[PDB]
Tab-separated table of N, CA, C and O in Angstrom:
chain	number	residue	atom	x	y	z
A	1	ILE	N	-22.785	17.445	-23.351
A	1	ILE	CA	-23.251	18.985	-23.423
A	1	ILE	C	-24.524	19.354	-23.046
A	1	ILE	O	-25.292	18.637	-23.118
A	2	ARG	N	-24.135	19.826	-21.351
A	2	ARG	CA	-25.423	19.989	-20.522
A	2	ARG	C	-26.380	21.161	-21.542
A	2	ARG	O	-26.263	21.954	-21.672
A	3	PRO	N	-27.735	21.216	-21.064
A	3	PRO	CA	-28.371	22.354	-21.648
A	3	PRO	C	-28.324	23.542	-20.942
A	3	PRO	O	-28.253	24.762	-21.655
A	4	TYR	N	-27.186	23.657	-19.633
A	4	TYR	CA	-26.718	24.616	-19.421
A	4	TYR	C	-25.714	25.528	-19.824
A	4	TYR	O	-25.517	26.755	-20.078
A	5	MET	N	-24.957	24.794	-20.603
A	5	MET	CA	-23.972	25.175	-21.560
A	5	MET	C	-24.440	26.244	-22.289
A	5	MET	O	-23.499	27.176	-22.842
A	6	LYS	N	-25.352	26.075	-22.880
A	6	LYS	CA	-25.825	26.684	-24.208
A	6	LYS	C	-26.331	28.336	-23.579
A	6	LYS	O	-25.969	29.350	-23.908
A	7	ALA	N	-27.128	28.314	-22.102
A	7	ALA	CA	-27.372	29.340	-21.514
A	7	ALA	C	-25.847	30.252	-21.207
A	7	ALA	O	-26.055	31.499	-21.705
A	8	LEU	N	-25.096	29.406	-20.828
A	8	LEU	CA	-24.101	30.396	-20.530
A	8	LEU	C	-23.054	30.947	-21.896
A	8	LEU	O	-22.620	31.860	-21.924
A	9	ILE	N	-23.187	30.230	-22.875
A	9	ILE	CA	-22.653	30.503	-24.193
A	9	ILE	C	-23.595	31.769	-24.607
A	9	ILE	O	-23.009	32.781	-24.922
A	10	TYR	N	-24.729	31.900	-24.441
A	10	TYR	CA	-25.295	32.988	-24.856
A	10	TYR	C	-25.252	33.900	-23.928
A	10	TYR	O	-25.209	34.923	-24.568
A	11	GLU	N	-24.778	33.850	-22.647
A	11	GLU	CA	-24.730	34.941	-21.889
A	11	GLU	C	-23.455	35.801	-22.203
A	11	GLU	O	-23.175	37.072	-22.008
A	12	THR	N	-22.472	34.879	-22.497
A	12	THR	CA	-21.314	35.114	-23.053
A	12	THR	C	-21.093	36.074	-23.976
A	12	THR	O	-20.481	36.992	-23.929
A	13	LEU	N	-21.571	35.492	-25.328
A	13	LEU	CA	-21.840	36.637	-26.425
A	13	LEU	C	-22.336	37.457	-25.884
A	13	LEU	O	-22.140	38.699	-26.518
A	14	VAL	N	-23.468	37.670	-25.112
A	14	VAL	CA	-23.727	38.888	-25.098
A	14	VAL	C	-23.219	40.186	-24.342
A	14	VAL	O	-23.018	40.970	-24.881
A	15	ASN	N	-22.562	39.611	-23.574
A	15	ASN	CA	-21.364	40.483	-22.726
A	15	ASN	C	-20.015	41.021	-23.652
A	15	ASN	O	-19.921	41.885	-23.409
A	16	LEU	N	-19.565	40.008	-24.372
A	16	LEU	CA	-18.564	40.160	-25.624
A	16	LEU	C	-19.330	41.486	-26.267
A	16	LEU	O	-18.479	42.066	-26.830
A	17	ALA	N	-20.483	41.392	-26.746
A	17	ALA	CA	-21.269	42.144	-27.660
A	17	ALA	C	-21.147	43.595	-26.929
A	17	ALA	O	-21.562	44.752	-27.767
A	18	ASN	N	-21.477	43.333	-25.583
A	18	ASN	CA	-22.131	44.867	-24.824
A	18	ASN	C	-20.943	45.700	-23.967
A	18	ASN	O	-21.163	46.296	-23.610
A	19	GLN	N	-19.890	44.456	-23.302
A	19	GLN	CA	-18.779	44.993	-22.678
A	19	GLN	C	-18.011	45.648	-23.494
A	19	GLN	O	-17.576	45.597	-24.673
A	20	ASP	N	-16.997	46.366	-23.063
A	20	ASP	CA	-15.607	47.203	-23.320
A	20	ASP	C	-14.700	46.034	-23.949
A	20	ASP	O	-14.530	45.464	-22.865
A	21	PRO	N	-14.499	46.481	-24.931
A	21	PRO	CA	-13.578	45.237	-25.378
A	21	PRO	C	-12.365	45.099	-24.645
A	21	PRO	O	-11.480	43.965	-24.730
A	22	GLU	N	-11.763	46.402	-23.664
A	22	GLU	CA	-10.438	46.027	-23.214
A	22	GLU	C	-10.896	44.684	-22.285
A	22	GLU	O	-9.721	43.680	-21.938
A	23	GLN	N	-11.868	44.197	-22.055
A	23	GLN	CA	-12.215	42.564	-21.079
A	23	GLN	C	-12.572	41.449	-21.964
A	23	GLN	O	-12.721	40.869	-21.152
A	24	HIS	N	-12.355	41.647	-23.304
A	24	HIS	CA	-12.957	40.558	-24.242
A	24	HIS	C	-12.175	39.718	-24.138
A	24	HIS	O	-12.855	38.369	-24.183
A	25	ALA	N	-10.719	39.803	-23.883
A	25	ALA	CA	-10.120	38.530	-23.069
A	25	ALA	C	-10.299	37.560	-22.844
A	25	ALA	O	-10.140	36.682	-22.483
A	26	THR	N	-10.646	38.617	-21.488
A	26	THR	CA	-10.805	37.561	-20.223
A	26	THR	C	-12.138	37.230	-19.871
A	26	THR	O	-12.145	36.064	-19.272
A	27	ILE	N	-13.196	38.189	-20.709
A	27	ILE	CA	-14.621	37.449	-20.898
A	27	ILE	C	-14.390	35.751	-21.621
A	27	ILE	O	-15.089	34.875	-20.984
A	28	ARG	N	-13.355	35.978	-22.565
A	28	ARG	CA	-13.386	34.938	-23.021
A	28	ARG	C	-12.595	33.299	-22.261
A	28	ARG	O	-13.300	32.244	-22.507
A	29	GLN	N	-11.305	33.611	-22.106
A	29	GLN	CA	-10.797	33.049	-21.265
A	29	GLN	C	-11.493	32.527	-19.837
A	29	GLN	O	-11.504	31.078	-19.673
A	30	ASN	N	-12.319	33.116	-19.040
A	30	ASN	CA	-13.101	32.819	-18.531
A	30	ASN	C	-14.214	31.687	-18.567
A	30	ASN	O	-14.383	30.937	-17.863
A	31	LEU	N	-14.954	31.951	-19.981
A	31	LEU	CA	-16.150	30.984	-20.082
A	31	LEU	C	-14.902	29.717	-20.861
A	31	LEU	O	-15.526	28.602	-20.320
A	32	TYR	N	-13.706	29.757	-21.066
A	32	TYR	CA	-13.080	28.843	-21.397
A	32	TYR	C	-12.984	27.916	-20.081
A	32	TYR	O	-12.456	26.351	-20.164
A	33	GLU	N	-12.243	28.494	-19.223
A	33	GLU	CA	-12.231	27.906	-17.601
A	33	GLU	C	-13.412	26.876	-17.445
A	33	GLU	O	-13.166	25.900	-16.966
A	34	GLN	N	-14.770	27.763	-17.750
A	34	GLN	CA	-15.752	27.027	-17.027
A	34	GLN	C	-16.007	25.961	-17.699
A	34	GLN	O	-16.867	24.554	-16.848
A	35	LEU	N	-15.824	25.690	-19.215
A	35	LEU	CA	-16.189	24.753	-19.846
A	35	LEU	C	-15.193	23.535	-19.790
A	35	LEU	O	-15.483	22.148	-20.218
A	36	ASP	N	-14.119	23.522	-19.661
A	36	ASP	CA	-13.006	22.468	-20.053
A	36	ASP	C	-12.908	21.907	-20.970
A	36	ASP	O	-12.837	20.494	-20.944
A	37	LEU	N	-13.063	22.322	-22.481
A	37	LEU	CA	-13.108	21.741	-23.593
A	37	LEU	C	-11.570	21.588	-23.973
A	37	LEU	O	-10.812	22.031	-23.927
A	38	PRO	N	-11.790	20.285	-25.221
A	38	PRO	CA	-10.704	20.351	-25.711
A	38	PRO	C	-10.092	21.408	-26.564
A	38	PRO	O	-11.163	21.584	-27.287
A	39	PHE	N	-8.879	21.505	-26.965
A	39	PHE	CA	-8.658	22.894	-27.829
A	39	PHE	C	-9.263	22.709	-29.328
A	39	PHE	O	-10.019	23.480	-29.588
A	40	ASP	N	-9.525	21.543	-30.009
A	40	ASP	CA	-10.767	21.715	-31.190
A	40	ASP	C	-12.110	22.144	-30.636
A	40	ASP	O	-12.535	22.965	-31.643
A	41	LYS	N	-12.740	21.663	-29.813
A	41	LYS	CA	-13.720	22.369	-29.395
A	41	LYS	C	-13.942	23.822	-29.131
A	41	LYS	O	-14.386	24.750	-29.238
A	42	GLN	N	-12.824	24.056	-28.350
A	42	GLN	CA	-12.389	25.602	-27.845
A	42	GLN	C	-12.601	26.370	-29.260
A	42	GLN	O	-12.815	27.140	-29.255
A	43	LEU	N	-11.910	25.923	-30.282
A	43	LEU	CA	-11.764	26.598	-31.371
A	43	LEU	C	-12.621	27.088	-32.239
A	43	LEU	O	-13.179	27.785	-32.735
A	44	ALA	N	-13.731	25.672	-32.041
A	44	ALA	CA	-14.996	25.783	-32.929
A	44	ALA	C	-16.258	26.660	-32.074
A	44	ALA	O	-16.446	27.809	-32.745
A	45	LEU	N	-15.734	27.020	-30.857
A	45	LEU	CA	-16.624	28.008	-29.767
A	45	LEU	C	-16.149	29.096	-30.333
A	45	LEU	O	-16.783	30.524	-30.580
A	46	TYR	N	-15.080	29.377	-30.686
A	46	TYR	CA	-14.343	30.799	-30.754
A	46	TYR	C	-14.659	31.341	-32.066
A	46	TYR	O	-14.826	32.330	-32.431
A	47	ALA	N	-14.268	30.498	-33.416
A	47	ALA	CA	-14.417	30.856	-34.341
A	47	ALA	C	-16.311	31.334	-34.861
A	47	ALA	O	-16.233	31.817	-35.835
A	48	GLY	N	-16.562	30.262	-34.602
A	48	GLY	CA	-17.866	30.667	-34.412
A	48	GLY	C	-18.861	31.494	-33.639
A	48	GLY	O	-20.046	31.982	-33.873
A	49	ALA	N	-18.244	31.352	-32.566
A	49	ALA	CA	-19.108	32.567	-31.667
A	49	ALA	C	-18.499	33.860	-30.826
A	49	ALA	O	-18.728	34.877	-30.650
A	50	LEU	N	-17.367	33.118	-30.531
A	50	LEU	CA	-16.707	34.315	-29.266
A	50	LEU	C	-15.851	35.321	-30.285
A	50	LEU	O	-16.030	36.349	-29.998
A	51	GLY	N	-15.410	34.717	-30.960
A	51	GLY	CA	-14.804	35.764	-32.257
A	51	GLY	C	-15.738	36.880	-32.927
A	51	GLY	O	-15.567	38.057	-32.840
A	52	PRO	N	-16.450	36.172	-33.715
A	52	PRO	CA	-17.744	36.907	-34.066
A	52	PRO	C	-18.186	38.075	-33.202
A	52	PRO	O	-18.568	39.296	-33.149
A	53	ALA	N	-18.686	37.685	-31.952
A	53	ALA	CA	-19.529	38.465	-30.954
A	53	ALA	C	-18.326	39.317	-30.580
A	53	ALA	O	-18.804	40.813	-30.098
A	54	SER	N	-17.002	38.887	-30.713
A	54	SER	CA	-16.037	40.274	-30.096
A	54	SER	C	-15.497	41.047	-30.772
A	54	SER	O	-15.714	42.516	-31.058
A	55	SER	N	-15.847	40.824	-32.524
A	55	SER	CA	-15.435	41.537	-33.749
A	55	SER	C	-17.008	42.190	-34.013
A	55	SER	O	-16.832	43.544	-34.881
A	56	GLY	N	-17.866	42.103	-33.072
A	56	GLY	CA	-19.088	43.025	-33.430
A	56	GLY	C	-19.919	42.674	-34.748
A	56	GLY	O	-20.915	43.342	-34.958
A	57	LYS	N	-20.093	41.143	-34.885
A	57	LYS	CA	-20.857	40.878	-36.197
A	57	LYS	C	-22.071	40.341	-35.380
A	57	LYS	O	-22.662	39.685	-36.347
A	58	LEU	N	-22.506	40.276	-34.224
A	58	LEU	CA	-23.324	40.003	-33.863
A	58	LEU	C	-24.313	40.448	-32.966
A	58	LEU	O	-24.659	41.390	-33.365
A	59	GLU	N	-23.859	40.969	-31.531
A	59	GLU	CA	-24.630	41.879	-31.208
A	59	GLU	C	-26.349	41.996	-31.490
A	59	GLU	O	-27.149	43.003	-30.611
A	60	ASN	N	-26.965	40.947	-32.234
A	60	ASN	CA	-28.355	41.140	-32.561
A	60	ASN	C	-29.019	39.698	-32.153
A	60	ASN	O	-28.295	38.809	-31.787
A	61	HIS	N	-29.970	39.635	-31.350
A	61	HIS	CA	-30.679	38.662	-30.833
A	61	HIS	C	-30.933	37.632	-31.652
A	61	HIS	O	-30.459	36.341	-31.618
A	62	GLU	N	-31.261	37.692	-33.027
A	62	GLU	CA	-31.178	36.688	-34.138
A	62	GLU	C	-29.963	35.816	-33.951
A	62	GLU	O	-29.690	34.767	-34.330
A	63	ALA	N	-28.901	37.040	-34.733
A	63	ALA	CA	-27.221	36.556	-34.853
A	63	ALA	C	-26.809	35.843	-33.683
A	63	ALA	O	-26.156	35.110	-34.063
A	64	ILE	N	-27.282	36.419	-32.775
A	64	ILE	CA	-26.441	35.703	-31.205
A	64	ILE	C	-27.096	34.044	-31.241
A	64	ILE	O	-26.648	33.369	-30.845
A	65	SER	N	-28.422	34.136	-31.412
A	65	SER	CA	-29.168	33.044	-31.314
A	65	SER	C	-28.606	31.678	-31.808
A	65	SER	O	-28.264	30.599	-31.748
A	66	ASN	N	-28.596	32.488	-33.247
A	66	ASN	CA	-28.078	31.533	-34.382
A	66	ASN	C	-26.739	31.060	-34.316
A	66	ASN	O	-26.163	29.806	-34.503
A	67	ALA	N	-25.608	32.381	-33.834
A	67	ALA	CA	-24.560	31.499	-33.492
A	67	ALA	C	-24.312	30.191	-32.332
A	67	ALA	O	-23.592	29.390	-32.377
A	68	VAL	N	-25.275	30.584	-31.514
A	68	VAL	CA	-25.101	29.814	-30.196
A	68	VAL	C	-25.929	28.273	-30.422
A	68	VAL	O	-24.997	27.424	-30.403
A	69	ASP	N	-26.765	28.190	-31.350
A	69	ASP	CA	-27.557	27.030	-31.650
A	69	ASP	C	-26.264	26.464	-32.434
A	69	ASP	O	-26.440	24.876	-32.379
A	70	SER	N	-25.568	26.865	-33.747
A	70	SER	CA	-24.545	26.092	-34.777
A	70	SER	C	-23.362	25.874	-33.433
A	70	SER	O	-23.028	24.787	-33.905
A	71	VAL	N	-22.851	26.688	-32.748
A	71	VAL	CA	-21.766	26.172	-32.135
A	71	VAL	C	-22.276	24.709	-31.030
A	71	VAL	O	-21.126	23.861	-31.003
A	72	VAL	N	-23.347	24.981	-30.710
A	72	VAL	CA	-23.748	23.809	-29.683
A	72	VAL	C	-23.568	22.582	-30.389
A	72	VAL	O	-23.581	21.573	-29.818
A	73	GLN	N	-24.319	22.682	-31.343
A	73	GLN	CA	-24.451	21.695	-32.499
A	73	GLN	C	-22.967	21.042	-32.647
A	73	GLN	O	-22.968	19.596	-32.430
A	74	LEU	N	-22.054	21.732	-33.035
A	74	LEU	CA	-20.708	21.436	-33.226
A	74	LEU	C	-19.964	20.632	-32.048
A	74	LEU	O	-18.956	19.518	-32.179
A	75	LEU	N	-20.489	21.281	-30.669
A	75	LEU	CA	-19.884	20.731	-29.533
A	75	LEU	C	-20.209	19.361	-29.379
A	75	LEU	O	-19.638	18.662	-28.652
A	76	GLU	N	-21.079	19.363	-29.681
A	76	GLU	CA	-22.446	17.575	-29.714
A	76	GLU	C	-21.854	16.576	-31.079
A	76	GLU	O	-21.886	17.316	-32.065
A	77	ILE	N	-21.725	15.758	-30.581
A	77	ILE	CA	-20.952	14.343	-31.624
A	77	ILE	C	-22.198	13.221	-31.443
A	77	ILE	O	-21.717	12.259	-31.146
């Protein structure tokens, strides 16, 4: 997991939290296309960050930063 992946995830959460819900599905799949992760890691990314961002449980600097840092830790082994 390269340092740039974190920036990408962070940016994606910001977009999911501030963009019209209509495009959330496409915003999420796009990031998946960019990262090409195995399903198990995709699920961790969704459950810990993409889903919460889409449901409006983040949308906050602190909350977003914590989700990003936590998921990145899960993505690394």
